[model samples]
Target: GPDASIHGSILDEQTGELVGSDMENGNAIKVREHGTDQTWYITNTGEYRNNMVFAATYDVRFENGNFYPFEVKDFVVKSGDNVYDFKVIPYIRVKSPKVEKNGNVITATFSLEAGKQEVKLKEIQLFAFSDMWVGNNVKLTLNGGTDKQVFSPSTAINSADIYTLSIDLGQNADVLKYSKNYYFRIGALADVSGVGTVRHNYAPVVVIKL
Candidate 1:
C-alpha cells in the first residue's frame, strides 16, 4: 500500500542529457503534496526497476491543513526491504524566485525594483520535525556534490506543529553541469507575520546537473 518510488537518469540541463531510464517514463514521476493540492503519479511497473537501483514506499496521511494523495503504500527491493517508509503532511510551499550570482553565470533576475515586498506567505516553513533525511544540506557551489553521495534527502516531514519537505534523489542530480551548477539558496528563517522578520528567496538556476 506504500509505494511512492522514483528512480534516476533523466538529464539534459545543458546537454548531459540522458532523458530516459527510470525504465522509460516509469510513469512520469510527479509527486506534489502540499496543503491538499496533492499530486502523485507513479503507476506500478513490475519489479519497479530491479537492479540499477530504484525503490518505493508510500502511505501518506495528514489531516486538516491538507495532504492526502499519492496512495499505494508498500513494496521492497533494496535486498528485500532495507527501510523505506514515507508519510508526509507538512504541505509544500516554495513559491520560487530570487537568485543572483554573476561570475559563473547563475542568475534568476526578476524585478519591479522597490522596497517592502517583504515576504508574506504565512511566514515560510519547511523544516518542522526531522527523521527522514537526504543530502544537499544547503550546499550551493552549484549543487553540493563533492560525492556527497549523490543527492539523498531521503524523506523529511517534521511534526511539532507541521513542517514538511520530501526529497529523494537516489541519483539523478546532474543539476545543470556547467561544471557543476545547482542553486537552492532559499532563506527565511522564521516569519508568520509575528514581526520577528527574516526573509529571502532565490531559486532559478535549477539546472540540477547535466
Candidate 2:
C-alpha cells in the first residue's frame, strides 16, 4: 500500500470559491510536456520507511484555454525531501519593452498612445495551495503590496509563483498619448534553503501604442 500525505484545496473556475475535488482537483500538472518537471508539493509526510516512500502523483495539462487532467501516477518520495516549503507552477514566455535591474528592484517601461486596447501580462504563479509554511511563512507581493487579483478558478492558482496580470487601458480613464510603467519585486528573503530564488526574467512587462 502507498502512504498518502496528500492535502490541498480546490477552487471554482469562475466564483473562485472552495470547491470539491471534482470541481478543480484532478490529475493535472503545470506546464506539462516538459520532462523532469517538478509537480505539486508535499505538505505533510508520515514516518520514513527506508530511504523511499510511495505516494500519488498529480498530472497537469492545458487545453481549451484552461488546464485539465488526463492521468495520474504512483510516485516515489526520497530522503530529506519535504514538499511543504516548495512551490510548483506553470512556465511561460513574455515580452517587455524595456527592463532594468537595480539591486533588488526591477522596473519596466511602456508607452500607450491615444487608443483603446487591453494589455495582459502572463507568466506562472509558482505557489499553489499546499501549507501555511509556503504561504504565511513565505510572502509574495505585487506592486509593493500583498493584494492579489482574483483568478477565475483554482485556489492552487493562488499559490502559483508564476502569474499573469492584465489591465484594460482607457476603460476607466480617458485615452491619452502617454508613457506607462509597471514594477514588481518578490523580496527573495523568505526563500527557504535558497530554492525559491531561481532566476526568472519574465516579469515587469508592458504594452505600448496598441
Of the candidates shown, which would achieve the greatest TM-score relative to the real structure?
1
> Per model, how many backbone clashes are there?
31, 20
**Weakest ten-residue segment in model 2 by summed lDDT:** 185-194
Ten residues in sequence with the least summed lDDT for candidate 1: 125-134
- Whole-model lDDT, candidate 2? 0.26
lDDT of 1 by residue, 98-142 (tens): 444344433332221111233222222111111111112233222
Show where candidate 2 strays beyond 4 Å: 1-51, 54-67, 73-99, 103-105, 108-137, 140-210
TM-scores of the models, in the given order? 0.23, 0.22
Model 1 vs. true fold: TM: 0.23
Compared with the true structure, what per-residue lDDT tens digits does model 2 show for residues 86-151? 122212112233434333333333221110122122222222121222221232332322223333
Q: Candidate 1: where is the Cα deviation over 4 Å?
A: 1-59, 63-100, 104-180, 185-205, 208-210
